[PDB]
Amino acid sequence: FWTQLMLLLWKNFMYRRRQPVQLLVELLWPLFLFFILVAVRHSHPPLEHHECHFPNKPLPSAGTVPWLQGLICNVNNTCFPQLTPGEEPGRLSNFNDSLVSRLLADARTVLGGASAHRAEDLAQELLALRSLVELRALLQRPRGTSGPLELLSEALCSPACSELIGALDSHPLSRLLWRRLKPLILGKLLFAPDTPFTRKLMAQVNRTFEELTLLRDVREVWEMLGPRIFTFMDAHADVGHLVGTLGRVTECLSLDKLEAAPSEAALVSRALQLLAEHRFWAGVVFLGPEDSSDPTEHPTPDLGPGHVRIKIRMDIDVVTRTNKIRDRFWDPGPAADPLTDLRYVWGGFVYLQDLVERAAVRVLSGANPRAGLYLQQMPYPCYVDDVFLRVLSRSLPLFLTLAWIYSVTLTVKAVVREKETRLRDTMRAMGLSRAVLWLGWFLSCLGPFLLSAALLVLVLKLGDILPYSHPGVVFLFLAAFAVATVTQSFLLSAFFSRANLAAACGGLAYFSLYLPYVLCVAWRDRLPAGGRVAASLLSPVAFGFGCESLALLEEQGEGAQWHNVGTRPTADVFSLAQVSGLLLLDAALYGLATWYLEAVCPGQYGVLVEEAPPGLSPGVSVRSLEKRFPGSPQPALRGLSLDFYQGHITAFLGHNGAGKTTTLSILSGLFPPSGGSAFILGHDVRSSMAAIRPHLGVCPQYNVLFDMLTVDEHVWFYGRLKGLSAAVVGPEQDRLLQDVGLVSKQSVQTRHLSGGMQRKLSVAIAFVGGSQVVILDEPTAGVDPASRRGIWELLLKYREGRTLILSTHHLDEAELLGDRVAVVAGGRLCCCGSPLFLRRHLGSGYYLTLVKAVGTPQLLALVQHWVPGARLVEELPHELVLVLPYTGAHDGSFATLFRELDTRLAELRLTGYGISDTSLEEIFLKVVEECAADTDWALTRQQLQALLLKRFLLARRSRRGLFAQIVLPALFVGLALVFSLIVPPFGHYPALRLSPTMYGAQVSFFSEDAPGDPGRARLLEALLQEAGLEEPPVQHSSHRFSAPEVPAEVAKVLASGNWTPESPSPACQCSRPGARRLLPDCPAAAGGPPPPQAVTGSGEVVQNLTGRNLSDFLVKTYPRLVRQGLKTKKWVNEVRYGGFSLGGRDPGLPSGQELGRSVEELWALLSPLPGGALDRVLKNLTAWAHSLDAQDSLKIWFNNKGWHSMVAFVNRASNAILRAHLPPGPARHAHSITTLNHPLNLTKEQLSEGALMASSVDVLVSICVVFAMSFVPASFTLVLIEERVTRAKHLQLMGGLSPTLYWLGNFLWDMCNYLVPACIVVLIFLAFQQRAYVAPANLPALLLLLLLYGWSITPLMYPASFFFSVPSTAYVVLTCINLFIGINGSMATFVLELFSDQKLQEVSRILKQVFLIFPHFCLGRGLIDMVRNQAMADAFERLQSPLRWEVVGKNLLAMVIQGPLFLLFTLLLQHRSQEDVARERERVVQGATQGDVLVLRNLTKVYRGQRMPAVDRLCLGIPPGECFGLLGVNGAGKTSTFRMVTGDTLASRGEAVLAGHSVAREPSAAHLSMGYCPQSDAIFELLTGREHLELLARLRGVPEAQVAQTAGSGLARLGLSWYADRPAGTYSGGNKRKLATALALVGDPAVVFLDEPTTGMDPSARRFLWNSLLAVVREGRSVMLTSHSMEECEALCSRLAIMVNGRFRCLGSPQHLKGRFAAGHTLTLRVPAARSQPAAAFVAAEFPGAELREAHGGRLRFQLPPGGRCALARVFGELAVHGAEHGVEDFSVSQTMLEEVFLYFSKD
Ligand SMILES: Nc1ncnc2c1ncn2[C@@H]1O[C@H](COP(=O)(O)OP(=O)(O)OP(O)(O)=S)[C@@H](O)[C@H]1O
Ligand SMILES: Nc1ncnc2c1ncn2[C@@H]1O[C@H](COP(=O)(O)OP(=O)(O)OP(O)(O)=S)[C@@H](O)[C@H]1O
């Protein structure tokens, strides 16, 4: 059991070692992919980012100075690691060291002090002020700045406008700020409705800009107070310079920047016009509830007024996209980038929403609410950003499968190859169980897999791809994967019966099972938990599911290790060990599947007796052996009771189908006997089992050798397997090697270098165990007769002792070697015995014939006198045949009769006698039928016409296939167009209702500071009851404690620490220690320790958090909220989006009443102006001082990952304020405000880019058209490939056909066939009303493009007919290649077009400039280009043409240029090719006979590497009036000479001339008069035979009116009347041969060539061929016939030439040969002594001529000079003594037998 496994493993290792280039490629292919992966890793290392905090943004409602301060200082949005002062519940401002704030505080305190006082005291107070000094220093600055923006930033933290432009264009930061401010400074507010209510709303919009325009009055009062004081009496210059600077800034002010529009269409037109001038900024639409014109939204929520809907339309390049709520790829980032994401800050959307909402509340409420709104960004933890790990999670299975596709292909190829040559059956014959075979396969294939896995593990660990992990677990994963994939490859090898088919399908079967993993990862959340395990039954799917868990565990900073093998890293991911368990279960299931499937198709591979020897020792005793198959009710083998005997070489006789090899397999260990017994050596076959193998040898009818192992390893392997010991193999090896004469070959150790002799070696293998019984099976099945002598010598060498049982098809072989013969025919035995006994039992006797150049009764009386027995069988004139009695036949009587007849020859006028001994052939036949009975220019026009007709009939023969290949794609396209009538989603921007409720269930805040006020209490009530909470606040007091219970294990930790809310209460948080990377921060159990009070309303949770830290709580709690949905990381639903803090502390000085009183007192005094301008200024100042209190504020925290959170929460705040200031009652339900977002249409320049991303249905239609359009050329080319496989094409070429004209005819017919599908597609497009195609300016372009693409595509794959030789696979491969090329081109172009965000891809347009050289992509590009150009034209002017040579003209021109070059290439590819014997050779050399039709001279062929000429130095001459014949054994070179003379092949040396026209010098006239007939059937099965006949008739040039009549003649000479109507496909075996003969004969060629015209068909067919050839030979025409059957050559031909080894031998007429050497007699002696000298000596002494023939041990034949003067009897009497003189049992004489010419044919 172990020795067989060792031998199998050694053999497999030897196969692998003898291929020293496949191992290297298998090792170095998977390393390339992983080196690419390592390079990719080196390209993108992970990025690290620490914690950072964000400042606050003040809305204009809070103030104007802080507003500009924010717009000028917080533009960069830089992170700050330290906590910002704004976040703390106390402060509400960030800038405390700013000059503006200090100046305002100093002014306030000085004014308060002055008011309290009411000069020296005031001067002293103002002297100690650094802010005034800083302001004076800033005023006294000699430029030093790029522009006023820099000075404004330093202070805070028209031709004049042209000068400002010139100054500000220099500084890049000033450029950025100026770009941000340009839309808004020069803005043009527009509104559609002009009703008075809207007028009041825009009056509320006015009042802000009116407050803005107040510096003019203060300025003018300054210059009207200036000169007065100056006349009454550095500071004066500084104020004037400052005032003039202020005036210059206000010079480039829009002032009246508000405008109006009459209607929505006019609104859009005016907006686009202003965009053309770069002046448009925003537009507002006050849609009314009663209008009911709501696109994709409800008309009105409640009847009547009270609800205001407001739409803001701005430029798309400014307002963010408004289609999807969230990003599709979650990123570990704060999502705070001013340039890209923070668009609402420099876009002004929030500003205008605030302004409009405040106007609406001030109008509807009827009060003047004051509440400053601020915006804050929640802070974000420290993080590591690394996209690569998700890429591994999604990519690693792909690279692993691509690395292991190669070894799987090799494994399946090897398994199928070894199971193809039936070697497995031979191994099972010797006794090896299938289990050992499969175990050898397992352990031999599984080595390289694990070596590759180990190398991959080392690469992964060392290459930093999977660090922080222990390689042991990774290896235990890859090993399970390798086991599963090897088992599944063995399963894949169990469905195929061909080598290359299995090799090319196994890789595809392995790769096609990785797609479901992608399908599952796309809809990751869709699939439940139940279907996960069911889908993970595939091996690659399970590997992917395990790889995702491995990557997920890698993200958490601790890789795969022994600690966490059985731990699930997330609630819905497999543990790493469970995946391996499933992998092993899958491998076991695949193994069981292979085991069961191997048994699905079992079995099928895909009374005369002479028993009396001197020693009766029945070594093999088979009795009544029977077997039956279910294929036929009659048994495969019937009763066979024959008994064999040791020492005799029994043999089997029968024609193929006699069930001999079946029985020989029964006796071996391959098949089971159904009945009877098969006792070998005494013990039954099954009982012996393994007790019989050393004493039983088998050799099968197929050669059994390994193409890589040498001879010595071969004998070693086949000896050690039988039971031989390793010590005694040397002598046995040497014995067999010396016996077979391979002692030289074992020196070079080759197996595939030597051929033909290999069968000999196989025979020797049957004699390696010295087994007593040996069963051979046709040891000379196919070996050349020239080498059967060695096999005969070896088999006779081992003829003693061993029982040998063989079987041969022949009849001569069964008597040379065999000591006995039994005849089996029709699966049954008929007779048995020995050749002597078989020849001694006949109805007839021993024949004697006499010819005439006297009297029958006289000769009969003479014969009866000389011998009593005599039978008269034949009595016709000119030959008298009598039967001499075999019963009691004696030599003396025959000798006396012959001696008497010798003298009386002249008188009797006989002049010749012929004796005859019955032979084995006729007795074999007679017993076979006895057993059978007992069982029961105009010519070119006609040529093209005929070719087109034959193509049309060829198409009409196969109509269903062409119909399904042509019409079906059109119906497919039509159905695709029908089903594509749904609304196309392309990315339009609908109307979106911007409210917080769109996000869904969430958690929100209501933090409050300084709650000591009733108005703030009302505002808080509005905020809470706005979200759906219960109306009475006291109910919350009824709920009392509404918080989750604190964790018990955390209470002790809290008691350990201070736990004050102001101090950091939570414990610290883990982060990146440098040696380890964590994606989130791992949260402890104490983050924001006390669970804050939460109340749930209607799908929403509100939390208190009053008085806590807030920032710390959010930073600590965020990852806990996120992690619930990081398993898939596709659409992450953050739960906390925003919240409110009711801050109340006033950063400014609240004491503004005193300042107002002081201003009023100053207004009363100082001579107020009668006009009141100063009075109005002072009133405005008093109002500003009164409003300076800022009684209540509000801050909104928002999360930026939700795109539309800022606007939703600002809307909520405004609505809450409105509901707060409205008096209580049911009227609260009547009032509401709504805000929408709707970007405007694209401008023309914007359209020129935006039209690109509106093509999905177009892409689908183009893909469908390309897929359905690339089928026809393959259908065209399959027919040509099929006609190339058969040599019928060349048969056409000997007609009038030329290859160029054949190509032209095929091209024209395929054009005519192709013109229909294009018309069908065109009519489908026209009938289905596609505006994209039914336009009159688009139809001609589409038609021309389709027709010219079909023009160009066809000659692409015509040159491919030479490469392939089978129709179906050629069609499949060509279709797949074309579809792959088209789809890849289209996808690459569309991907580069959509993803062309960066500029270095637009130059990739040159790539398409190359694709015009590819003809398949021209149509796909042209359709898309035409569609986009025409759609742009439709959308351009309504709200240049396809025929122009700018969109499709260039592509069409390039493709029509490409058209003819492929036809030229295939036309050039077609024409790529550019003693009697001595006396007749001498007469040919000296001169040429003019009458001879064919003349040859030194005809020679030298193949490549054969080292010997197949046909060498061949000469001949054929007179026209005689039929020729060529003879030779297989391998002589007759077919090579036939091909060379016909012209299908070239000649290495020498040329043959036919009727004075050499083949090379001008082939056309040569082929005009040659009738080609090969052994193969060169016909088209689709057509009919008669149709072939008229096709050849029309090609030749027969007039049409007689062509049909010719058909009758074309059958009248060869019958064919019953088979005329039937198609050529459904005929008989000989019908094809006779049809080929008729096609050769039709047309009346001068000479007719036939290669093996008849090979064992019905006698009627050969009689008809005989008649046809006789006709053509006595009508004065010549035939060159090649055959084997000698009687046909005798009957038909008049000259015979015999050739062996490529050279003539006799070259004479049949009668000349018969008289030259086939006369006399030959003697055969049966000597058992096997001694040459005793038999040779006396024969040479008495007879001068004793030439040897087949000198073997059993028999020897004698050649002697003919024409003995004495009688023939002169030998017989001598033999009558010679039996005593020398050992001779019996004898035979062949004296002018019917087999003399046969004997010479077999002689040489
Ligand atoms: N797959 C099969 N293989 C062999 N024999 C079959 C098969 N199917 C049916 N038979 C039976 O085989 C008989 C016909 O002779 P075969 O057994 O095929 O001859 P054979 O053994 O191939 O002949 P030789 O002369 O020994 S090569 C009929 O009884 C068939 O029904
Ligand atoms: N691929 C090949 N095709 C044809 N002949 C070949 C090929 N390879 C070698 N030969 C030579 O063909 C010769 C043996 O076949 P031939 O005598 O030419 O014809 P044939 O086998 O008698 O023809 P049939 O009767 O039509 S199968 C030897 O010279 C071979 O070396």
Ligand SMILES: *[C@@H]1O[C@H](CO)[C@@H](O[C@@H]2O[C@H](CO)[C@@H](O)[C@H](O)[C@H]2NC(C)=O)[C@H](O)[C@H]1NC(C)=O
């Ligand atoms: C949020 O927390 C505060 C505590 O700061 C709760 O205020 C209490 O409310 C009840 C009911 O109105 C009063 O009787 C208590 O006197 C309040 N306590 C203090 C110390 O303020 C408040 O109820 C909680 N939620 C709400 C409804 O705002």
Ligand SMILES: *[C@@H]1O[C@H](CO)[C@@H](O[C@@H]2O[C@H](CO)[C@@H](O)[C@H](O)[C@H]2NC(C)=O)[C@H](O)[C@H]1NC(C)=O
């Ligand atoms: C701006 O876009 C709107 C669509 O949002 C266009 O209005 C539609 O125009 C089509 C004609 O092309 C009509 O069939 C629709 O009924 C219109 N819908 C609406 C809502 O009116 C509008 O024509 C575009 N204007 C410009 C100048 O591009």
Ligand SMILES: *[C@@H]1O[C@H](CO)[C@@H](O)[C@H](O)[C@H]1NC(C)=O
């Ligand atoms: C923002 O800060 C970065 C810090 O490097 C600086 O390089 C950049 O110029 C700043 N940009 C603006 C707009 O201030």
Ligand SMILES: *[C@@H]1O[C@H](CO)[C@@H](O)[C@H](O)[C@H]1NC(C)=O
């Ligand atoms: C602002 O600065 C002043 C003067 O240094 C200081 O008294 C005051 O406490 C500061 N206030 C804040 C908000 O830090």
Ligand SMILES: *[C@@H]1O[C@H](CO)[C@@H](O)[C@H](O)[C@H]1NC(C)=O
């Ligand atoms: C105020 O807005 C109104 C629209 O109601 C507009 O007519 C007017 O010009 C604006 N005021 C000024 C002077 O800009």
Ligand SMILES: *[C@@H]1O[C@H](CO)[C@@H](O)[C@H](O)[C@H]1NC(C)=O
């Ligand atoms: C909040 O927590 C932070 C954590 O650094 C701490 O520095 C800060 O003092 C705390 N502030 C309050 C008022 O809770």
